[PDB]
Amino acid sequence: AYQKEYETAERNIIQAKRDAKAAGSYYVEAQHKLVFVVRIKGINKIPPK
Amino acid sequence: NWRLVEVGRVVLIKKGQSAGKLAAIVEIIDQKKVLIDGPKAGVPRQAINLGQVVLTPLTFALPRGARTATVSKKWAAAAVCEKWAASSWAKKIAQRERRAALTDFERFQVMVLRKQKRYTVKKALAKA
Amino acid sequence: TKVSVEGVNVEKFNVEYFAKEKLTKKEKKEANLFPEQQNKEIKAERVEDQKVVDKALIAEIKKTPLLKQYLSASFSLKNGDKPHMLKF
Amino acid sequence: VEPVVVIDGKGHLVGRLASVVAKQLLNGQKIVVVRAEELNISGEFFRNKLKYHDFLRFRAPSRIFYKALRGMVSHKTARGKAALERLKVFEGIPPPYDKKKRVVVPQALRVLRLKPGRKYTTLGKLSTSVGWKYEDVVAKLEAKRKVSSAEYYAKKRAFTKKVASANATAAESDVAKQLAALGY
Amino acid sequence: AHFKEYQVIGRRLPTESVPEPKLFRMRIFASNEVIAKSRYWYFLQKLHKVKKASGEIVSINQINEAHPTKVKNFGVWVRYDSRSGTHNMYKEIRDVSRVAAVETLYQDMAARHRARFRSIHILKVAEIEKTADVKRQYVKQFLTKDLKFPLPHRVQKSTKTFSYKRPSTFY
Amino acid sequence: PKIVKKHTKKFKRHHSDRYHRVAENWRKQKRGNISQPKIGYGSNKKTKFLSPSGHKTFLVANVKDLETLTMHTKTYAAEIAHNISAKNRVVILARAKALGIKVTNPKGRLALEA
Amino acid sequence: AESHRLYVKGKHLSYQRSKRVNNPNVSLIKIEGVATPQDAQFYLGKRIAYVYRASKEVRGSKIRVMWGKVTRTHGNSGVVRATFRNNLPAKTFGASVRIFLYPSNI
RNA sequence: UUCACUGGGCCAGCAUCAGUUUUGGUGGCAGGAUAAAUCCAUAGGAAUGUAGCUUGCCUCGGUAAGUAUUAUAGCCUGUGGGAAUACUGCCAGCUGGGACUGAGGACUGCGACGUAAGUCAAGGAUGCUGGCAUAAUGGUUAUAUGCCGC
RNA sequence: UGGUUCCUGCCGAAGAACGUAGAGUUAAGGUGCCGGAAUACACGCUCAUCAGA
RNA sequence: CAAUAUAGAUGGAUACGAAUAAGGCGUCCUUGUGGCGUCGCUGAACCAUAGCAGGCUAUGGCGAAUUGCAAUG
């Protein structure tokens, strides 16, 4: 059910973009409600905030 | 006697995806870049820096900015594929390809035939 | 370079055929502390196997040109021999 | 690939050739550098003249190139001393090296590295201008060498022309076609 | 890196009792979409008082060349900051595609003017269609009839240590 | 098992060669080119106290001490104490070879005559 | 008849090093006729011998051999890393070292 | 006493694995302007104007400068048809090479393949072979090399 | 004022927090030679009678 | 002690000169700053290279093994 859900979701978003192109209007995307964050700097010389 | 960068100068891309394919300068861009197409060799029409390619002493007449179907027409009508194959340099290139293509029993036959040819030449030598 | 193996009935001898022999009686007490060196010879059955394989193998070789002389000559690396480039 | 590498110095740059040779001696390749007087320096004569001057506060071109090369190698180490012991440097080409081929190092060539329309400097003129009073001796020997070498090359070309004739009459034979079949 | 054309549209947000604002469209040359969007906001704030929080991007798009086989001629308007003062500059470029011309233009501006990619603000790239509208002499140098010249830099990378040949720029 | 040692050399005091009055035992100073002892060099607990033969050594003074290694022959190895007289060392050797225990130091204070 | 070489000779260049600290464990090898790391992929894992000649005759000969193998490439020029059983004495920098074809993939 | 079988430890090489990693070769997808191109079909256009024509100097025919928009070259643009490929992403696609590692120690667990019994790459390496008692091998020193060290 | 005697572990104030190793990947910094690593590639500028790095 | 090797042997260090916005080679003549053709665009070349680490005999004919699957050998 999960794999079917991902497939239907991606085909729906792509077809919604295709429907915006076919209707000549614009599609706006929903904001991505999840990110991933990676630490870049060492522990020294960091402000306490 | 100089080669010149010009339209109809058939060229050879020594370095790249071609790494040796006969192309032709269709148009110049500047002192650095040109437009080429090699549709007989299979390399597509593209812009290129001149360092990646070498000029051949062969040329023919090619129209300015000629399209690819016109290019292949003038290429075949030039028949510079045969003029290229008749050149000793392309013969040397095919030869150094064939030397890499050799097998060890082939290379041993090369050894034996070099012995036999050398025997016949040294008989032909020291009598003339 | 390939030859046909089909003329030879190779299947007979096995891994066990090449098992190196053993001694008994603790080498018969070293013949009572006197060494003996007649054991150096090859068993004749090994020679017969070599001949039987060798006939049907030479019969394959003689159909191909220059292959006997190829197997007779050894191989070395000359100057400029680059085995990563040397297609075998 | 060669035991002793013989390197001509004509038409070459100082530092690039020095870097190449200094690398190869630390690699263990034995090198003799010949016709050293015909090394070329970037920039005009006068700049390089002032550089030898303010360095000086040995005049032979071999000593100059040896100086430049010795600067690049860590000379104080025993390994660097063995690397320098591999080296020979000569102005002109004395015997026995006159009868052997002299290679060139393309990444140190003057005609490739220098842009046209630049002043360069001949090392022999520099050495004579700073007190190496032997340059006329050099060209006198080199003229005789070029005479005998032209003789050798004229003989060699005629003999190889005979070899070309013998290979030409050896052609069309079936052993030649079988070599063609194998590619030779 | 190698850039890309981008149709980028922004519409700064339809508020309550203000439906459908005016869908401002620009075309950005950028290596990716992210810096394209950043540059789009960086121009849109210079257009009028927006912020990236004030509006949104409508549609990010790549647009290819219609005819990437033909060598076109271009007249380009650039503005940038010789840090204290700004000035415009009009350059003419003979190039196959648009985005390669913009690439070479950034390289030339960084060469001659020490200006960064952020300091350079592209005004317009447009094809010069007919000849003799090439105001610059150096592009006009390549507009001659039957143009031929020899190669400079016959020096190549020799790729080996020692040469037996005593080589020659034999061209 | 495969004995890891983690440190082949020894741990010497700083400037121990520079003076003859200074010993070579480890004493804490109170460049980094000197190896300093620390608990990271401590050997693996299985591999700890193992000979190159692969045994754990055990000092033996007399035969009653040797009989304590009767069951643990493959794990341990008997070592005769330095001060055992030569009459007792041969008795210990005969008893140990009867028990089949590897003596670490045979031929101590002893020779084989005729 | 004239040649009996079943190896590629190549120079023991150096130890793996920074500007100040060298690793004697990894050694650096220049294989002749190799300029690319892709050509050096052929030489991966191959069995290397440093052949040298001693004064004394250890077991019927005065010539001794260290062994080891190629681990990985090093740099752009086709310079090749190597690890031996015992490390090299470092007076063998620029020495000819034999690289054998076994373990052969072909 | 006869006969038959077998042998410890270490160090190697190879195979099959497992874990980390590195370097290849190769396939199928999915998106875009549903790639753009190119190719083909059509209409106009122009010149860095091809054929033709006119004219003039001139080596019996070369030039030039007009004409001439395709002719005895073509180009460009517009529009229509069709793919392919690039790029980007995905594959619980295939396959190869190299390095390092072998902790743990009767069984239990999750599995998977198997109709079944069983098997297995599945709760950490086993199998095969070689060498070795005038050992194998290991250590000690002194010197040398390289790097670092007031 | 100067000196004040064994070890290890743990706690411990007023580019990167480092047990001992093996393997890999990198920050910064570099990749003519010393010196490990592209005398790579691309585009422009400078020939200085002590540029410049 | 030797019938040897030391910074690193195990096919061969295999020879024009100059020019480079030019050369070379061959050839022809009007011997020239002539003409013609060729060539480069790497030595990835060339030369050497079979036989017990290279046997014994006359395209032949006998020998090689067991050093047992790598361990300078």
CSV table of C-alpha atoms (C1' of nucleotides) in Angstrom, one decimal, chain I residues 2-38:
chain,number,residue,atom,x,y,z
I,2,G,C1',65.2,27.8,47.1
I,3,G,C1',64.1,22.7,47.3
I,4,U,C1',60.4,18.9,48.6
I,5,U,C1',61.6,11.4,46.5
I,6,C,C1',56.8,5.4,42.8
I,7,C,C1',53.0,4.3,38.7
I,8,U,C1',48.2,4.2,36.5
I,9,G,C1',43.0,5.3,36.3
I,10,C,C1',38.9,8.8,37.3
I,11,C,C1',37.0,13.8,38.5
I,12,G,C1',39.0,18.4,37.6
I,13,A,C1',38.2,24.9,38.3
I,14,A,C1',39.5,29.9,39.1
I,15,G,C1',41.7,23.6,10.4
I,16,A,C1',40.6,20.7,14.4
I,17,A,C1',38.9,19.1,22.2
I,18,C,C1',43.4,14.7,20.8
I,19,G,C1',42.8,6.1,24.7
I,20,U,C1',45.7,2.3,21.4
I,21,A,C1',45.6,0.4,16.3
I,22,G,C1',43.9,-0.9,11.1
I,23,A,C1',41.2,0.6,6.7
I,24,G,C1',38.6,4.5,4.1
I,25,U,C1',37.0,9.7,3.4
I,26,U,C1',38.2,14.8,4.1
I,27,A,C1',38.9,20.3,6.7
I,28,A,C1',42.6,23.8,6.0
I,29,G,C1',46.7,23.9,3.1
I,30,G,C1',48.7,22.6,-1.4
I,31,U,C1',50.0,19.5,-6.3
I,32,G,C1',57.8,22.6,-11.4
I,33,C,C1',62.0,20.4,-7.8
I,34,C,C1',63.4,20.0,-2.6
I,35,G,C1',58.1,17.8,-1.6
I,36,G,C1',53.6,13.7,-1.2
I,37,A,C1',50.2,15.1,-5.1
I,38,A,C1',47.8,18.0,-12.8
